[PDB]
From a paper:
The eukaryotic polymerase α (Pol α) synthesizes an RNA-DNA hybrid primer of 20–30 nucleotides. Pol α is composed of Pol1, Pol12, Primase 1 (Pri1), and Pri2. Pol1 and Pri1 contain the DNA polymerase and RNA primase activities, respectively. Here we report the cryo-EM analysis of yeast Pol α in the apo, primer initiation, primer elongation, RNA primer hand-off from Pri1 to Pol1, and DNA extension states, revealing a series of very large movements.
Numbering used by the authors:
A (entry chain B): 42 to 174, 180 to 250, 254 to 299, 317 to 483, 496 to 528
B (entry chain A): 206 to 402
C (entry chain 1): 1273 to 1452
D (entry chain C): 248 to 580, 606 to 705
E (entry chain 1): 792 to 815, 848 to 1055, 1063 to 1130
The structure:
């Protein structure tokens, strides 16, 4: 397709700033565009999910997401590239999440909430243009039923749009359009008496019905895409990105201070488990040693202090001679820091790469405790962290659903007041600790002048 | 919940003319002071008004339902004065409308309607304790008009034909209803066929 | 970006005047070349590079890499076989060694070549030059590690002065990057 | 199409080559598929077999011999297995890597396929034309003969950037020769040119603004000069994989964008590499990869060895029905090479299965023009030599078609069509540039 | 091949019933698995699908003009077809044979019963080639696609069930699924496998899968490219990793075999690895000092 024809089709599609994603995007995009747009939309959806799991109000979620919109997925722009980004990201995520039923449910829920937010941020004229772009009633029919419709919708207006004055409510109602549809499609709104009923037809709260239709259509299209996926399995190029995206949903620091309580309060439970295993056994197996070493490098421990740390931890029991440590372990610890071989500076393991680990056996301390520990044992340490029974129950409920990172964020929040990286947990804890220390110092200074 | 849903407001307007004639005169349940305290007072919103009405009715026993209904307004007017009187008047009117609905609005059995698998007694069945026939109901129906099975037997002894008994009008009414239902079913089948083409 | 280009090879320039060869690491410190306020300058003979003398070498390196990629070398996954060949069996992934179960793969994969072209592009990304995220062309133990380190403000001003040259050099790579 | 290479798709193309040639052989020799069997397994009946010539070892010496070849079978024929060849019973043959062949042989002991005879792939049918079209071409030429000039790069020497010889040639064609069509092959600005390669590009005093990219160098160095070609001479531009102006460095190679070269629409046409096209009735087959230099034969027998190499190579090109039949592609060690995009080897086959009347494959070898299997094969040589001395270009003059003169052969059938006889009607001159 | 048996039985049954007969995947998790891994046989997937959903030539209404169109399984009102009836007959006869085997005392009759049961199982599992094979006398693309889609569904819900039991699907296809039990003891692994079998049978009444191989350790690269310590008495078993033994001297093969023995032993993965390092350094010293028999250096 000529670039010009492609632009024409895309403009015919965007006549409104909002879309049902009915027709497949046509055109070619590069792999960098593919992956970057997919990851950006995925970040937006993950932030939506994290806000929802914390029972945040709709206004708070909107306020949190607006800067993320301006940064990752610009909406309400006239640029063709941003609209292309939204459409292609949506269809890439359709390809990603069609594999399993639970993924489908999470995707449709998050996408419907995103639809709701975007519709809420639109202007009333744009909303009218979008809904016009499901039969609207004539002005005569609205005039005949005006009293009943206004009586039905006055409470919804007051509570949803904060139109406290009656004059404003009437003025809005005069401009509001109504849709006539059978009450069986809007039984949910019928139950709460939010829609007017006449002769078996419900007069429309429109956002809720639009979201319901969008979710239903999205579910059906995900099912069709799942049926057509094995034909796409022949593309060696997209499969790794799709697999990664689908699984993505799931001298202050030296060798001595890393053991201190001041630094020890900040690690996540995985790191505490690895360090406890190292202290008890004076040895960590390969995966645990790698996880711990990469964390320690990521938190500021230099290479020489890392070698000192590992040698001191390993030789404490006398079972390991310094000669054996230098013969077998020194090379690997230097390699982790990019000082050996191809000098590759290995990045610290995020949560996802840790979970991609092969499951800890007997004698293993690596992995994620929230996935790899029994419920009783997790309850034991969460009690040791002075968490209440309700907080422990919430964390265990998050763990049961497979949202281990959500539970990690939860324990962070309860112990300190979305995290997907051990170094991120450490950094946030350190920043909070420094802020608290500065506040305490300011309070001490203020109390000394009276 | 306020404002009323149009169904609720329409039902209130339909029930308002009957509230006086039934409750305040024919049944007169609040003539008894204890019954008044138990059922009429708890529908009010203001504790001071409730206490004042309770004291007034204790000092003046056995006022009829209409008299108590007027006393509610009189004492509320005596109590609620100033710029805030309008809100009190509106709330009292709302409480009175809520009591009208509480007393006259349909009170359905909620279980039988919920599920498709629920069983309900077939029409024309005999009630084991009264012997009344579960006859269909028209606008003129009253419980005393339901024929009894023993009376139907007595009629059949004189005339051995169902068409000559008191059960016949109800049978005719049901037959007409069934005929109309069948005609509408044929119309719906035709409409479905037209929609499919 | 740090891990994206770990295996790419450096862009080697030849001085038109004195024939000295040196890698081009963008606007960074180097013993062999200097980017001046008025263009790229070889430090051995002080002579200046004009766009054509740079862009022709950039295009020559890109096309040499593309020709090598289309040479179609295959390598065997199996670490005990490891043969490198250009023969392609009608079953592509099958190794041509008798009984070998390794998976043949194009030695110069399109992912590697796309990474190389992206490294070339990042060399003349002005914004990437300013924040200093280019991959180093020298290890610390290299004998040619540069004796003087350029400052941040010098890098900013110099990149601003040389914007046209960097944009033209970037367009030369983008000529093939849009086709890849 | 982008720069992607997929092993499965390339293997699909390589399999399809063998399958199509199997079907062609069965049709030509009227043989049933039951007659064809798998040559990699032991059978004690003589069988028919089709496959690809490959070295018996994947890591092979640069020089092959008649005792070190194998036959690669298709997926259906032999599950992709490769069998060594026993050619002790064949005295005369000529093979090359990537050639698709048909054998009548016998694999007796499991480790060797003994070829008893060769099954030469038939030569493709020649194009034909109706009487009406030939009369229209007769009217087009106005009696006079058809003149077409073909030139090939490089156009300027290795130690300078002078196109004075090109200007001389343009003036000659404009005012004396006056051809109908002029076909120019690449490379125009060769990227393996040592001055371009080493960055030794000087300031040009005759340009008001110096070029900043090789594309601007073309626009300022060639396009003025090419614009002086007379508008009555339609000219055809065919790239090479070494053309700097091309952003498609793979064979088959997409045609240049004429607008990007700023060449006017009036007489400038850009054609793909390879390209097949008609000039009047004449069918042209043009490919810009040096098959003649690259195809290296294994040979037995005095008869074939006594033959000219060029006729053998041209017959190989005709039989394989593809302009660049060698595989794997040749390489220049890394500097340049064939740059075959194996996934699209379909596009380099003869268009429609017709053998072009005149096939032009420029070569670094000496210029030649020869008639092989009733096809005129032309190598016009390089326009200018490395040292700057005169190169060569080829002039093709074809007698105007005439149904009455008898040189056109009528093809029997209900619908009368006529075989073009270009080898009877074309005179080809190799003129020093 | 299986083609003769499948087509022949089908044509026999069809001619007998008054019918006119026609004229003549989850990618492996490469690496070392310390926990016990069980190979769970899924050969009866297709016959159980055909039997459960009453898929047959006479029950599935299909568009015979466009063979690529996917049909729908017949409703439960449709009587059992000839094909599912034959499959049910085979399964019932196999159950009868096993019931007889449980009581039988004579070794001769017991072996005969086992052979009968094996033949019945082979036919039941080969019955799909009737309608799946492209060159089959009874080929039917819509029915093959229906059965294949149902098998895909069943395999994915099998993954979900395994994850519900905190199990990891190491590798899987229509024929076998390998599960990481997460245990290091034979009894625990077998109990986990039997529990998984019970769950799969609970969700699919006609699908009876069983344990085919017990892997104490598993260094996996592909379905048929792996090494493992199989339990029957643990024994080293390698598949697809002994392709090129000729090119390596006996010393190299001895080193390789010893390393495999040590890494897959029941010792802790650090003391065994230090044993490997001691062995390797000792080998280096003997090679540098040339104290090894020259026979071990020979290469043919
Ligand atoms: S959620 Fe991530 S950071 Fe937290 S304990 Fe688990 S692996 Fe560690």
């Amino acid at each position: 397709s000529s670039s010009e024809e492609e632009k024409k089709l895309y403009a015919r599609l965007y006549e409104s700033k909002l879309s049902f994603y009915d027709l497949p995007p046509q055109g070619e995009i590069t792999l960098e565009q593919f992956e970057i747009w997919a990851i950006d939309r995925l970040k937006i959806l993950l932030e939506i999910e994290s806000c929802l799991s914390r029972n945040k109000s709709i206004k708070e979620i909107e306020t949190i997401i607006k800067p993320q919109f301006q940064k990752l997925l610009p909406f309400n722009t006239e640029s063709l590239e941003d609209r292309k980004k939204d459409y292609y990201s949506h269809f890439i995520l359709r390809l990603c999440f069609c594999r399993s039923k639970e993924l489908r449910e999470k995707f449709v829920r998050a996408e419907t909430f995103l639809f709701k937010i975007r519709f809420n941020m639109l202007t009333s004229t744009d909303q009218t243009k979008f809904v016009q772009s499901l039969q609207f009633i004539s002005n005569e029919e609205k005039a005949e039923l005006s009293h009943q419709l206004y009586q039905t919708v006055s409470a919804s207006l007051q509570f949803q749009l904060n139109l406290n004055e009656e004059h404003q409510r009437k003025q809005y109602f005069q401009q509001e359009k109504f849709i006539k549809l059978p009450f069986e499609n809007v039984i949910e709104l019928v139950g709460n008496r939010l829609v007017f009923l006449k002769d078996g037809y419900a007069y429309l709260q429109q956002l809720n019905l639009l979201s319901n239709e969008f979710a239903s259509k999205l579910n059906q299209e995900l099912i069709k895409t799942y049926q057509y996926l094995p034909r796409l399995n022949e593309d060696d190029r997209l499969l790794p990105i799709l697999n990664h995206l689908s699984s993505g949903y799931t001298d202050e620091i030296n060798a001595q201070s890393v053991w201190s309580e001041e630094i020890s309060s900040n690690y996540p439970l995985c790191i505490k488990n690895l360090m406890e295993g190292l202290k008890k056994n004076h040895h960590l197996r390969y995966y645990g040693r790698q996880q711990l070493s990469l964390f320690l490098k990521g938190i500021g421990l230099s290479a020489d202090e890392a070698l000192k740390f590992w040698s001191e931890a390993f030789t404490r029991n006398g079972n390991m001679t310094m000669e054996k440590f230098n013969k077998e372990y020194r090379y690997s610890f230097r390699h982790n820091y990019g000082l050996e071989g191809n000098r590759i500076n290995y990045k610290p393991w995020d949560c996802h790469t840790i979970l991609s680990k092969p499951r800890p056996g007997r004698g293993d301390y690596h992995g994620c405790p929230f996935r790899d520990w029994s419920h009783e044992r997790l309850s034991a340490e969460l009690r040791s962290m002075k968490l209440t029974q309700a907080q422990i129950i919430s964390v265990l409920d998050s763990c049961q659903k497979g949202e281990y990172t959500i539970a990690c964020t939860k324990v962070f929040e309860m112990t300190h007041n979305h995290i997907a990286h051990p170094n991120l947990y450490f950094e946030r804890s350190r920043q909070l600790q420094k802020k608290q220390q500065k506040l305490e110092k300011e309070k001490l200074f203020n109390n000394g002048n009276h | 919940k306020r404002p009323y849903h149009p169904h609720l407001a329409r039902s209130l307007e339909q029930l308002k003319p009957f509230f006086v004639s039934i409750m305040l005169e024919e049944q007169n349940p609040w003539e008894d002071d204890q019954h008044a305290i138990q059922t009429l007072l708890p529908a009010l919103y203001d504790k001071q008004l409730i206490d004042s009405l309770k004291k007034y009715w204790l000092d003046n026993p056995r006022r009829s339902s209409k008299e108590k209904w007027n006393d509610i307004d009189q004492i509320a007017t005596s109590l609620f004065k100033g710029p805030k009187q309008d809100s009190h008047i509106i709330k009292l009117r709302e409480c009175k409308e809520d009591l009208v609905l509480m007393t006259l609005y349909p009170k359905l059995d909620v279980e039988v309607t919920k599920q498709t698998i629920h069983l309900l007694k077939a029409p024309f069945c005999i009630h084991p304790a009264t012997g009344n026939v579960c006859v269909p109901i028209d606008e003129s129906f009253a419980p005393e008009k339901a024929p009894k099975l023993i009376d139907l037997q007595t009629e059949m002894e004189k005339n051995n034909d169902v068409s000559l008994t008191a059960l016949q009008p109800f049978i005719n009414q049901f037959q007409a209803y069934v005929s109309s239902l069948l005609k509408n079913e044929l119309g719906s089948v035709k409409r479905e066929r037209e929609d499919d083409d | 970006d740090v891990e994206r280009f770990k295996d790419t090879v450096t862009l080697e320039l030849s001085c038109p005047s004195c024939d000295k060869r040196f890698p081009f690491g963008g606007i960074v410190s180097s013993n062999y070349y200097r980017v001046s306020y008025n263009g790229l300058q070889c430090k051995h003979c002080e002579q200046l590079f004009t766009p054509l003398q740079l862009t022709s070498q950039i295009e020559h390196s890109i096309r040499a890499h593309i020709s090598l990629y289309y040479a179609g070398w295959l390598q065997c996954d199996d670490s005990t076989c490891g043969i490198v060949t250009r023969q392609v069996s009608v079953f592509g992934k099958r190794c041509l060694n008798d009984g070998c179960t390794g998976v043949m793969r194009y030695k110069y994969s399109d992912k590697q070549l796309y990474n190389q072209l992206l490294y070339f592009d990042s060399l003349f990304d002005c914004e990437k030059n300013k924040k200093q995220e280019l991959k180093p062309i020298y290890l610390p133990d290299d004998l040619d590690y540069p004796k003087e380190q350029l400052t941040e403000s010098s890098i900013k001003a110099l990149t601003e002065q040389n914007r046209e040259l960097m944009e033209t050099g970037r367009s030369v790579v983008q000529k093939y990057l849009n086709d890849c | 199409r982008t720069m992607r290479q997929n092993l499965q798709e390339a293997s699909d193309v390589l399999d399809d080559q063998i399958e199509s040639f199997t079907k062609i052989i069965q049709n030509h020799y009227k043989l049933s598929p039951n007659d064809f069997a798998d040559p990699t397994i032991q059978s004690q009946s003589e069988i028919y077999a089709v496959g690809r010539i490959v070295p018996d070892s994947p890591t092979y010496d640069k020089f092959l011999n008649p005792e070190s070849l194998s036959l690669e079978t298709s997926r259906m024929g032999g599950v992709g297995r490769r069998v060594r060849l026993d050619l002790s019973q064949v005295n005369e043959l000529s093979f090359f890597l990537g050639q698709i062949v048909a054998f009548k042989g016998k694999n007796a002991n499991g480790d060797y396929f003994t070829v008893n005879s060769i099954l030469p792939l038939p030569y493709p049918n020649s194009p034909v034309s109706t009487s009406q079209e030939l009369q229209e071409f007769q009217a087009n030429l106005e009696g006079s003969s058809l003149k077409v000039i073909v030139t090939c790069g490089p156009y300027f020497a290795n130690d300078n950037f002078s196109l004075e010889l090109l200007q001389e040639f343009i003036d000659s064609i404009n005012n004396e020769v006056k051809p109908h069509v002029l076909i120019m092959f690449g490379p125009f600005i060769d990227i393996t040119h040592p001055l371009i390669a080493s960055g030794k590009l000087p300031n040009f005093p005759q340009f008001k603004t110096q070029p900043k990219t090789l594309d601007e160098l073309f626009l300022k160095l060639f396009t003025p000069i090419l614009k002086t070609i007379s508008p009555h001479i339609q000219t055809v531009l065919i790239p090479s994989t070494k053309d700097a102006i091309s952003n498609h460095a793979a064979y088959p190679q997409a045609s240049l964008i004429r607008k990007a070269l700023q060449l006017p629409k009036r007489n400038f046409k850009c054609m793909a590499n390879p390209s097949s096209f008609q000039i009047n009735e004449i069918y042209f087959g043009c490919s810009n990869v040096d098959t003649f230099k690259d195809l290296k034969e294994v040979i037995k027998g005095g008869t074939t060895s006594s033959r000219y190499r060029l006729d053998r190579v041209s017959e190989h090109i005709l039989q394989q029905r593809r302009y660049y039949p060698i595989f794997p592609g040749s390489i220049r060690t890394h500097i340049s090479g064939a740059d075959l995009d194996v996934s699209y080897l379909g596009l380099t086959e003869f268009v429609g299965g017709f053998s072009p009347d005149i096939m032009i494959i420029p070569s670094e070898l000496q210029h030649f023009a020869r008639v092989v299997q009733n096809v005129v094969v032309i190598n016009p040589g390089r326009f200018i030599r490395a040292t700057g001395n005169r190169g060569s270009y080829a002039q093709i003059t074809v007698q105007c078609p005439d149904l009455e003169d008898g040189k056109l052969t009528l093809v029997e059938g209900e619908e009368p069509v006529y075989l073009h006889n270009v080898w009877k009607r074309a005179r080809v001159d190799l003129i020093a540039s | 091949t299986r083609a003769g048996r499948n087509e022949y039985i089908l044509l026999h049954e069809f001619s007998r019933n008054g019918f006119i007969v026609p004229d003549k995947v989850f990618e492996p998790e490469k690496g070392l698995h310390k926990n016990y891994v069980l190979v769970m046989d899924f050969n009866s997937l297709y016959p159980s699908i055909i039997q459960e959903f009453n898929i047959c030539f006479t029950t599935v209404d299909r568009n015979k003009e466009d063979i690529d169109e996917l049909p729908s399984v017949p409703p439960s009102e449709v009587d059992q077809g000839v094909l599912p009836r034959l499959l049910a007959n085979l399964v019932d006869r196999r159950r009868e044979v096993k019931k007889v085997m449980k009581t039988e005392t004579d070794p001769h009759k017991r072996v005969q019963c086992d052979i009968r049961q094996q033949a019945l199982k082979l036919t039941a599992n080969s019955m799909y080639g009737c309608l799946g094979y492209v060159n089959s006398r009874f080929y039917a693309k819509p029915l093959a696609m229906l059965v294949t889609n149902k098998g895909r569904e069943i395999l994915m819900n099998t993954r979900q069930l395994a994850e519900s039991m905190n199990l990891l699907v190491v590798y899987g296809d229509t024929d076998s699924v390998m599960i990481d039990t997460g245990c290091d003891n034979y009894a625990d692994a077998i109990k986990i496998g039997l529990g998984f079998k019970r769950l799969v049978n609970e969700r699919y009444r006609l699908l009876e899968i069983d344990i085919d191989n017990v892997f104490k350790k598993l260094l996996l690269h592909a379905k048929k490219k792996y090494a493992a310590l199989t339990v029957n008495t643990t024994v080293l078993e390698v598949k697809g990793l002994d392709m090129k033994r000729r090119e390596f001297c006996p010393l190299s093969r001895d080193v390789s075999i010893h390393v495999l023995n040590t890494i897959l032993s029941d010792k802790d993965p650090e003391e065994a690895l230090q044993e490997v390092y001691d062995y390797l350094e000792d080998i280096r010293i003997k090679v540098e000092t040339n104290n090894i028999r020259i026979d071990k250096y020979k290469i043919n």
